[PDB]
From a paper:
The 2-oxoglutarate (2OG) dependent hypoxia inducible factor (HIF) prolyl hydroxylases (PHDs) are targets for treatment of anaemia and other ischaemia related diseases. Prolyl hydroxylation of HIF-α subunits signals for their degradation via the ubiquitin–proteasome system. Inhibition of the human HIF-α prolyl hydroxylases (PHD1-3) has the potential to mimic elements of the physiological hypoxic response. We report structure–activity relationship and crystallographic studies on spiro[4.5]decanone containing PHD inhibitors.
To inform the SAR work, crystal structures of tPHD2 in complex with our 1,3,8-triazaspiro[4.5]decane-2,4-dione compound series were pursued. We obtained a structure of tPHD2 in complex with 11 and MnII (substituting for FeII) (S2 and S4 and Table S3†). The new structure reveals that 11 makes similar interactions with PHD2 to those observed for 17.13 The 3-methyl pyridine ring of 11 penetrates into the 2OG binding pocket. The active site metal is chelated by the tertiary amine of the piperidine ring and 3-methyl pyridinyl nitrogen of 11. The biphenyl substituent of 11 is positioned in an aromatic pocket formed by the Trp-258, Trp-389 and Phe-391 side-chains, with which it makes hydrophobic/π-stacking interactions. The terminal phenyl ring of the biphenyl substituent of 11 is positioned to form a cation π-interaction with the catalytically important residue Arg-322.17,18 Arg-322 is also positioned to hydrogen bond to the imidazolidine-2,4-dione ring of 11. The pyrimidine ring of 11, which is not present in 17, is positioned to form a π-stacking interaction with the phenol ring of Tyr-310. The 3-hydroxypyridine derivatives 38, 41 and 44 were produced because analysis of the PHD2 structure in complex with 11 suggested that replacing the methyl group of 11 with a hydroxyl group may form additional interactions with PHD2, via hydrogen bonding to either Tyr-310 or Tyr-303. The inhibition results with these derivatives reveal the pyrimidine ring has a minor role in enabling potent tPHD2 inhibition, i.e. the non-pyrimidine containing analogues 23 are only somewhat weaker compared to 11 (IC5011, 0.253 μM; 23, 0.741 μM). Prior analyses of truncated PHD2 in complex with a spiro[4.5]decanone inhibitor reveal a binding mode involving chelation of the active site metal (Mn(ii) was substituted for Fe(ii) to produce a complex stable for crystallization) via the tertiary amine of its piperidine ring and a pyridinyl nitrogen.13 Chelation of the active site metal of 2OG oxygenases by a pyridine ring is well precedented, e.g. with pyridine carboxylate inhibitors.
Residue numbers in the entry: 188 to 230, 253 to 407
The structure:
């Protein structure tokens, strides 16, 4: 599906109906492999915050710009949100050391973030061997979903209490990149609570 059709015919209806949406083969093999190389070159869990213009991060920047265009093509149809910006990218290297993340909500208290977008980099990742599954518990539903951290897979989900999630421990190093998109009204309300530079 082309980006306009992908947004309007798949991401929008899927987010509105389920609050979670998986796009496989988002950028293609060549672009995905370049992003994987850049992330491995960056120098317990290791988190680095990336704007996209740093040396050796050009293809990470391309991923970010591509996620931005896809969101733009949703034409304000994602929930009631007016999306006008996003965070930097959280580039994460998770060692396979048998630690996980307890069930949590990314934005439980109105900090501005409305959509979590995760891009995965793990080729031939077997969850039954290496672990690292993301388990999402959509609010009020009888079912939950385990998401495999597949190479070139883009995951969207609402960042608020609709999607508590936990991360299973892993036995091989996992790499993922996350951005969060802001709702204009929520982000404006968050900014009345303090002063510049604080
Ligand atoms: C690790 C993981 C894997 C899969 C799914 N979820 C998670 C965890 N969640 C995802 C990552 C998590 C915790 C929740 C998270 O949202 N923000 C975060 C917090 C605040 C803003 C912000 C930015 C601008 C304005 C307002 C707010 C942006 C991001 C972290 O800094 N985070 C984090 N996480 C681990 C180590 C350090 N920091
Ligand atoms: Mn999370």
């Amino acid at each position: 599906l082309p980006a306009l059709k992908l947004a309007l015919e798949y991401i929008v209806p899927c987010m509105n109906k389920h609050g979670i949406c998986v796009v496989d083969d988002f950028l293609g093999k060549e672009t995905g492999q370049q992003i994987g190389d850049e992330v491995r070159a960056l120098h317990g869990d290791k988190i680095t915050w990336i704007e996209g213009k740093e040396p050796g991060c050009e293809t990470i920047g391309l991923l970010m710009s591509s996620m931005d265009d896809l969101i733009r093509h949703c034409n304000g149809k994602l929930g009631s949100y007016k999306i006008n910006g996003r965070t930097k990218a959280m580039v994460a290297c998770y060692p396979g050391n048998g630690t996980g993340y307890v069930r949590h909500v990314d934005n439980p208290n109105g900090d501005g973030r409305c959509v979590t977008c995760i891009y995965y980099l793990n080729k031939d990742w077997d969850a039954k061997v290496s672990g690292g599954i993301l388990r999402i518990f959509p609010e009020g539903k009888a079912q939950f979903a385990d998401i495999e951290p597949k190479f070139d897979r883009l995951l969207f989900f609402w960042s608020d209490r609709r999607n508590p999630h936990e991360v299973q421990p892993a036995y091989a190093t996992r790499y993922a990149i996350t951005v969060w998109y802001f709702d204009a009204d929520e982000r404006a309300r968050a900014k009345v609570k303090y002063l510049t530079g604080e």
